[PDB]
Amino acid sequence: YDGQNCKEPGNCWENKPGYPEKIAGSKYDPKHDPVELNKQEESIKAMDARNAKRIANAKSSGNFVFDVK
Amino acid sequence: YDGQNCKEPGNCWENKPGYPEKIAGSKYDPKHDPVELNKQEESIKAMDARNAKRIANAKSSGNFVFDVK
Amino acid sequence: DADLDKQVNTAGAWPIATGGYYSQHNSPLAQINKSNVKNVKAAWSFSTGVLNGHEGAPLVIGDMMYVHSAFPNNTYALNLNDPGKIVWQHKPKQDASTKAVMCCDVVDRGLAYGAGQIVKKQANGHLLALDAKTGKINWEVEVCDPKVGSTLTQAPFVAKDTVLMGCSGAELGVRGAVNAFDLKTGELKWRAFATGSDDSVRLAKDFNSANPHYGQFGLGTKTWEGDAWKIGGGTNWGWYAYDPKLNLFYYGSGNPAPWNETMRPGDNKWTMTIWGRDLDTGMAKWGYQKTPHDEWDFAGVNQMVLTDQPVNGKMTPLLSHIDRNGILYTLNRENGNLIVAEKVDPAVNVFKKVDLKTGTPVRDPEFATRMDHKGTNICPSAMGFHNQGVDSYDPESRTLYAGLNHICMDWEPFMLPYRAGQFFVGATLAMYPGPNGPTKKEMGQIRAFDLTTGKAKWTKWEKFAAWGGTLYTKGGLVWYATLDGYLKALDNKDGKELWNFKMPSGGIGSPMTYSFKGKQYIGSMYGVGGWPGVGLVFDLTDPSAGLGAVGAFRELQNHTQMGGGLMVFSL
Amino acid sequence: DADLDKQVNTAGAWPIATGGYYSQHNSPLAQINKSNVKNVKAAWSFSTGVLNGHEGAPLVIGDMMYVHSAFPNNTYALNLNDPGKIVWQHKPKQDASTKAVMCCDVVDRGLAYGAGQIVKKQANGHLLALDAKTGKINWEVEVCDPKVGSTLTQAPFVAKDTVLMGCSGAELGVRGAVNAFDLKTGELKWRAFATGSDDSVRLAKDFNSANPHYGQFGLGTKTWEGDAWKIGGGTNWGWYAYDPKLNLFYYGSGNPAPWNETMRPGDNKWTMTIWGRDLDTGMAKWGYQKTPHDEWDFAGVNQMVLTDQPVNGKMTPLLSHIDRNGILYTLNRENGNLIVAEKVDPAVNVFKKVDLKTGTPVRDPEFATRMDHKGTNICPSAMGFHNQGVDSYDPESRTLYAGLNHICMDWEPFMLPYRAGQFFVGATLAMYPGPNGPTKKEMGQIRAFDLTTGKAKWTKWEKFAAWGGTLYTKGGLVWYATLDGYLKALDNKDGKELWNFKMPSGGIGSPMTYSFKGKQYIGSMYGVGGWPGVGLVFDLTDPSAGLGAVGAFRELQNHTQMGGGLMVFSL
Ligand SMILES: O=C(O)c1cc(C(=O)O)c2c(n1)C(=O)C(=O)c1cc(C(=O)O)[nH]c1-2
Ligand SMILES: O=C(O)c1cc(C(=O)O)c2c(n1)C(=O)C(=O)c1cc(C(=O)O)[nH]c1-2
Ligand SMILES: [Ca+2]
Ligand SMILES: [Ca+2]
């Protein structure tokens, strides 16, 4: 694996000798929990909502309040 | 009470007007607990013993050790 | 905005952490020069009342200076006419737990300025705009969630009516993104992620049209197995640059997560990428991945320096950057064309070289990392041959003065699960001095480079890594702070040390300069910390602790102790 | 011992915190003078890596300097040939709970030296002797028990083969005592208590033979009701003085406990007493109680200054001292005769005056304190018109340059029980500036005095209290640090300010000086704290908090922030 054998432009990864092409099902399977994987997105969704409310409240009231609800 | 009326040399205290000569039995009685009052002396006794042991051990061994037993 | 432009065009002002939109971190102030620098003395000083690493440097707007501390991220405003009076101050209330999810000390790289406001963030993820004269909070919004391991450390960057802000946390699997906010209201305009769908990464319709071989569409997911990109890193916590004419801002996305390369097969795009994005829409015009499938934590967030220089006699709009991987890159900043890709030190061995035609590193398997194997004598180490330091450029001699690290390592990864809010590293390291120091113990270098060829002009060795960076002033001086506590000035011609002052503690930020009432001043933060100082700062002694930094910097505490403040010098 | 004497007689050395055995805190070094002080600049600096108040000053033995921090009481040894290298260091491991029983910030007033050892203590009560060259611990013993509210803050004092050390804690009912230890082994020689039986107080057979009206035997218990003396305070946490020829050491015992005067009727001897004790046996030759039955927390621990001057033409061996109560005292140091007792400022109203014949203060009932009454506009306040500052004496003009406080108060006591380990104050206060400042807002003064008459020669006002003290150097300069962060130098003839430098944080110690390679250096600690800075240091805003100091010093945090270090200056 010297990075010079590309299956497609910009995709040149190769498994090293003795390692799998795909880790799913192998002894290197990370077995990630989808629930954990999606936590960042869920947090951002809720956070964006809180900020939107702050922005809207400041616009309508004329004063900015962080704890608005 | 101007400090100039001494009952004896070096003992010039006087109760202020309207205050008791002795506070024991008065509304200003501190009611200190005897055992509680002696805590400092008891602590020093134990402390002095610990130091004595450290000093003695250092003199006999030639090396100073704070935690000796 | 127009106000920031006004300050940028004000002689002696310092409204941008990197020295200007092009981030050349230099100054035309020449009162202090090679002939009189020996007479420079301390003017005054200011303690922040906070310990831990004090990165960045203060801002100077008009006759006011703004100083910032490490977590809890305090801001202090001073009028230069009386440094003894704190005009206003902002002391954030943050949960102590915020520190638990910060990988590399509770550092803060600085404040920004725009529309008459000081733009500041907090480690806990808040971004605020405070009136520059009164300190009144105009807006305060959430940018990162510490509960999932996301925090804020980099300096915000202001361009037009936009504030760019990126979260930190790749060591905790945080998916990186540059977030854009309205300078006036704090409203979220958009965010460009480093991994995932092209829509989420915000790629222009003609993304990399000039270099299709760099890769174009669908790679944010195709170069990963399954949903691994969701916790794929790529955080940008370094520095930015901006070209007003092209309306493009530039920055580098960080390392992929976890450090265990075996757990994430694929090029892992678009982590460790140099970007050219439209400021208004955030759409990437071009993107160059420096380190496909990272195996060494060469977080690609280092400074982007824009310059206009002749390449083989032809004037060209350039972008230069020295990555953690030890390669000095120079690209055409308009289209992303790769022009230079040279090793900053011959010790670099992860790559035999970077192929200018294929555009990728020619990897040397002997120095790769992988499961069930301990790689040894790998250079650079994860701390890189260059980290968060801000370097300087002299437009006359056309030279970049780089603050480098000369540290290599041993590395072995291991399997571990991902749990939002918990660290997600997966590797054990041992770091030590590189092989080329005069006594093989030196870990720092100030090395001058020609950015059009990538060739060095001179070198000055330092016992410890040159972590903070360098500042160049027209008097022909290269200023920089050392981890052991000195502020130094070198002759830019040969690196000869001309002046030095023993500050209270090591400096991990880059010096700044400004003028006030007819006099040039040099300012430097002090207070050792950051990754190099974790051993000293957190009372660690295990050589492998601190991601392996403890062993490498075990001697630092014999030269300095913690601190937190600013020291100013002048003639 | 002999080794200490060698250092004392070494030009340019600084082996004693107070400047010498007589504690005149001065120096014959005259390189820096009135004509060239304007050219003094910072030489180098050193951060301790600790915050909170940094009292005291470093020691210089030969070509080595020893720096100390606030709790956890770290020691740093530096060779002056290279201040960047920490030759050796001692960083104690102490329970954080120790800070909870410290009344007035976690301060440390300095190190001592003797028999080639650095004598250092820790707030948790440990006293150690470390080899001055290697830092090796030769001995470590317990002196105070924090579990009963006893801690260590004052600098140890070495005389011959003895180390004098006194515990702090009167605010917690700690019964004061000067503890004496063997300089070579750390073995307890004896301890002289401030209250109790004559045997425990250690009074010579001829105690006060020259002034029987001062009181003699049995008063350690007779001037108290019952066993109240057992928790009667009298701790000595200030400074000492020593006369080798007379073999007498001097110091002042602290305030009686609790602050509630109604809970302890009687003169409360021997708290608030100036002592003259034999160094080898600890037996008191004489003892003068300055404030019988304290009602204002005028802890009588202030500096003792020994001088030999003509009193109205007759040469006399003197001891001078400015107490918290606002009275400047000058006594014959051989026999205790009272010679001078003048108010350092006319605002003092607790006493109409001190009667030289009766030897006691003529109390003014209008400004006394007592249960069920709120005393108002009482001067001095509990912080005193003079606190822990170390003043200087110019032997040529025969002048003492005193760092004074100009703060008064309102006070009302309240009943409370005693529980070992818990605070035992019993009073609520309000403090504010005295009535004589130029704008009636100033709280500090540098006032020059003739010790044989108690009359002032000149006054320089300061916004905040002159807490640290002053240093006098032969070039005709009075050096001092301010709470707002400046190190200053005044013309000793008129008090005119000739030089100043803005240090990182306020200074609460007194400046020191030494010579290295023939060059004179001035050293000052920085890092605000102590009683004045409790509001800033502990985030307090209640004006009555900090024993009433918070309100009085509310503006300090607008001028300075915490810090911790040393700054050195020279030509
Ligand atoms: O992946 C990330 O998000 C992240 C964040 C930070 C940071 O924000 O301090 C560092 C790093 N990585 C790490 O790669 C690194 O080398 C580093 C050094 C420092 C520093 O300030 O000394 N921070 C960081
Ligand atoms: O009664 C005592 O034992 C005791 C101890 C201390 C100390 O050791 O810090 C202070 C005081 N009292 C208190 O009276 C006082 O004015 C004071 C000021 C300071 C300081 O360092 O600023 N300490 C102390
Ligand atoms: Ca990283
Ligand atoms: Ca007291």
CSV table of C-alpha atoms in Angstrom, one decimal, chain A residues 1-4 9-13 16 19 21-24 27-30 32 36-41 43-44 47-48 50-51 54-55 64 66, chain C residues 126 138 140-143 145 173-175 185 191 214 225 230-231 261-263 265-267 269 293 295 358 360-363 370-372 415 418 420:
chain,number,residue,atom,x,y,z
A,1,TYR,CA,0.0,0.0,0.0
A,2,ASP,CA,1.9,3.0,-1.3
A,3,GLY,CA,-1.1,5.1,-2.1
A,4,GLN,CA,-0.4,5.1,-5.8
A,9,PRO,CA,-9.8,9.2,-8.8
A,10,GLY,CA,-9.4,10.4,-5.3
A,11,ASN,CA,-10.0,6.8,-3.9
A,12,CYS,CA,-6.6,5.2,-3.6
A,13,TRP,CA,-6.9,3.3,-0.3
A,16,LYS,CA,-2.3,-3.6,3.9
A,19,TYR,CA,-5.5,-7.1,6.6
A,21,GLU,CA,-10.6,-5.3,2.3
A,22,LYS,CA,-13.7,-4.9,4.5
A,23,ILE,CA,-13.6,-5.0,8.3
A,24,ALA,CA,-17.3,-5.9,8.8
A,27,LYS,CA,-11.7,-9.6,13.8
A,28,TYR,CA,-11.3,-5.9,13.3
A,29,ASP,CA,-15.1,-5.2,13.1
A,30,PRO,CA,-15.7,-2.1,15.1
A,32,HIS,CA,-20.4,0.5,16.2
A,36,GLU,CA,-24.2,6.2,19.5
A,37,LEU,CA,-23.2,7.1,16.0
A,38,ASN,CA,-26.3,9.3,15.6
A,39,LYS,CA,-25.8,11.2,18.8
A,40,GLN,CA,-23.9,14.1,17.3
A,41,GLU,CA,-26.6,14.8,14.7
A,43,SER,CA,-27.5,17.0,19.5
A,44,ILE,CA,-27.0,19.5,16.7
A,47,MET,CA,-29.0,22.9,19.6
A,48,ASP,CA,-30.0,24.5,16.3
A,50,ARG,CA,-32.4,26.5,20.8
A,51,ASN,CA,-30.4,29.0,18.9
A,54,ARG,CA,-32.8,32.9,20.8
A,55,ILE,CA,-32.4,34.6,17.4
A,64,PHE,CA,-30.9,39.3,23.4
A,66,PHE,CA,-29.8,33.3,26.1
C,126,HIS,CA,-20.6,29.2,23.3
C,138,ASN,CA,-24.9,41.5,21.9
C,140,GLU,CA,-24.5,34.4,22.6
C,141,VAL,CA,-25.2,31.1,20.7
C,142,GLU,CA,-24.2,27.5,21.0
C,143,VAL,CA,-21.8,26.1,18.5
C,145,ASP,CA,-21.9,20.3,22.5
C,173,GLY,CA,-14.9,11.1,17.3
C,174,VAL,CA,-16.4,14.5,16.6
C,175,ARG,CA,-17.3,15.0,13.0
C,185,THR,CA,-27.0,38.5,15.1
C,191,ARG,CA,-22.0,24.7,8.2
C,214,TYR,CA,-7.7,15.0,-6.4
C,225,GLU,CA,-16.8,1.7,5.2
C,230,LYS,CA,-20.3,9.8,11.3
C,231,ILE,CA,-17.6,9.7,14.0
C,261,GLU,CA,-6.4,3.2,11.3
C,262,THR,CA,-7.6,-0.4,11.1
C,263,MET,CA,-11.0,0.7,12.4
C,265,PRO,CA,-10.4,1.6,6.1
C,266,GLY,CA,-10.5,4.1,3.2
C,267,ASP,CA,-9.0,7.5,2.2
C,269,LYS,CA,-12.1,12.1,2.8
C,293,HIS,CA,-6.2,7.5,5.3
C,295,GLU,CA,-2.3,6.6,10.3
C,358,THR,CA,-0.6,11.8,-8.7
C,360,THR,CA,-0.6,11.9,-3.2
C,361,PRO,CA,2.0,10.8,-0.6
C,362,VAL,CA,4.1,7.8,-1.8
C,363,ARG,CA,3.7,5.9,1.4
C,370,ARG,CA,-1.7,-0.9,11.8
C,371,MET,CA,-3.3,-3.2,14.3
C,372,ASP,CA,-1.2,-5.9,16.0
C,415,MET,CA,-9.5,-1.8,19.4
C,418,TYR,CA,-17.2,4.6,20.5
C,420,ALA,CA,-20.5,9.8,22.6
